[PDB]
């Protein structure tokens, strides 16, 4: 059966400013099948206050999901997204890069 | 609204 690897993007809703509340987003797209594990990480720990969009898919039948939470960026806090899927031999970590 | 008439594959 066909399998498609999730494309992972980790990014803030608005440009990041320390001490100013914002939204952390992990957008995963282009994956198949739909079974997938997505976690937002703060300094290596799973954020429990995370919502996600409803399962949908693109023209090519590949699925997409947005995971998101409120967060106030600081100097030292490191954020990331951990994704596990059948196409991945091991959980993939994508770190948040505010300077891109 | 969605389609109300459905048929099995």
């Amino acid at each position: 059966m066909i399998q498609r690897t999730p494309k992972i993007q980790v990014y803030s809703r608005h440009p990041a400013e320390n001490g100013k509340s914002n939204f952390l987003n992990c957008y995963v797209s282009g994956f198949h099948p739909s079974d997938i594990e997505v976690d937002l990480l703060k300094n290596g720990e799973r954020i429990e206050k995370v919502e996600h969009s409803d399962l949908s898919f693109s023209k090519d039948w590949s699925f997409y999901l947005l995971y998101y939470t409120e967060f106030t960026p600081t100097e030292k806090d490191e954020y990331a997204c951990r994704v596990n899927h059948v196409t991945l031999s091991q959980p993939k970590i994508v770190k948040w890069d505010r300077d891109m | 609204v969605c389609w109300g008439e459905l048929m099995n594959l």
Binding site: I2, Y11, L55, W61 | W3, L6, L9
Partner: protein
């Protein structure tokens, strides 16, 4: 032009009971309804401010119909398991999408209705709305069954009538958000990756709808082969983001230009380093 789209996903769970069913509805790039089989609600729910207007008849009806969808897909999983001679110990996925596009005159432009099984095209309504494209033999069986039952007629009746009607209704009610255009706020970032190389990234932010094109040129020559282009992503506030990046030799920055096209821009935009 505008569009209404319904998406349905059913995933079989061997041993874990009945399959997971998820339905979502969209007007263009804006979701307005949803249904989750594993939710305690067991109702079609609103996901847009402008759909909350609808009375109890709407929600009851859509709930009943979406439940019917869930059941039909549930049967479809077993049927297809039969068609392909597959085991009962593997998870499989059925996907259905259908809907309609209207043009500037708010009249029927296009219609579509397609099924995929395990990530792969299964059966699709052709553009003439009266014939089927079947990707394999099982789908040909399905095609025989649907042809004998004249499904395409009823389907066309929905696509050309009800679908367009409710599309225009929704477009009217949520005109503030659906009939809007947010021009992309564009800029370019420059970051040395090495002593001799630099990443040039072209950004488009806060735009609606999602359709947009970002291209890099080097002295007028298109650079798609050497451009990293991410999938257009939601900001979470109803707008979208996208960037395209190129890694260039340091000192050649002025050769590179970014080109942005969006319906919110009065004309295509060119950003440059000088």
């Amino acid at each position: 032009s505008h569009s209404m789209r319904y998406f349905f996903t059913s995933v079989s769970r061997p041993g874990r009971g009945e399959p997971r069913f998820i339905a979502v509805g969209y007007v263009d790039d804006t979701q307005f309804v949803r249904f989750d089989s594993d939710a305690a609600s067991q109702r079609m729910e609103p996901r847009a401010p402008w759909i909350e207007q609808e009375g109890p008849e709407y929600w009851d009806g859509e709930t009943r119909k979406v439940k019917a969808h869930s059941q039909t897909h549930r049967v479809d999983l077993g049927t297809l398991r039969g068609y392909y001679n597959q085991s009962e110990a593997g998870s499989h996925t059925v996907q259905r999408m259908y809907g309609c596009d209207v043009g500037s005159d708010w009249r029927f432009l296009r219609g579509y209705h397609q099924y995929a099984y395990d990530g792969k095209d299964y059966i699709a309504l052709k553009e003439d709305l009266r014939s089927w494209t079947a990707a394999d033999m099982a789908a040909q069986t399905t095609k025989h069954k649907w042809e004998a039952a004249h499904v395409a007629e009823q389907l066309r009746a929905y696509l050309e009538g009800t679908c367009v009607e409710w599309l225009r209704r929704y477009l009217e009610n949520g005109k503030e958000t659906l009939q809007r255009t947010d021009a992309p706020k564009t800029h370019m970032t420059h970051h040395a990756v090495s002593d001799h190389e630099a990443t040039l990234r072209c950004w488009a932010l806060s735009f609606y709808p999602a359709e947009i094109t970002l291209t890099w040129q080097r002295d007028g020559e298109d650079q798609t082969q050497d451009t990293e282009l991410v999938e257009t992503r939601p900001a979470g506030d109803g707008t979208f983001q996208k960037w395209a990046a190129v890694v260039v030799p340091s000192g050649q920055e002025q050769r590179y230009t970014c080109h942005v096209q969006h319906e919110g821009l009065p004309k295509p935009l060119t950003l440059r380093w000088e």
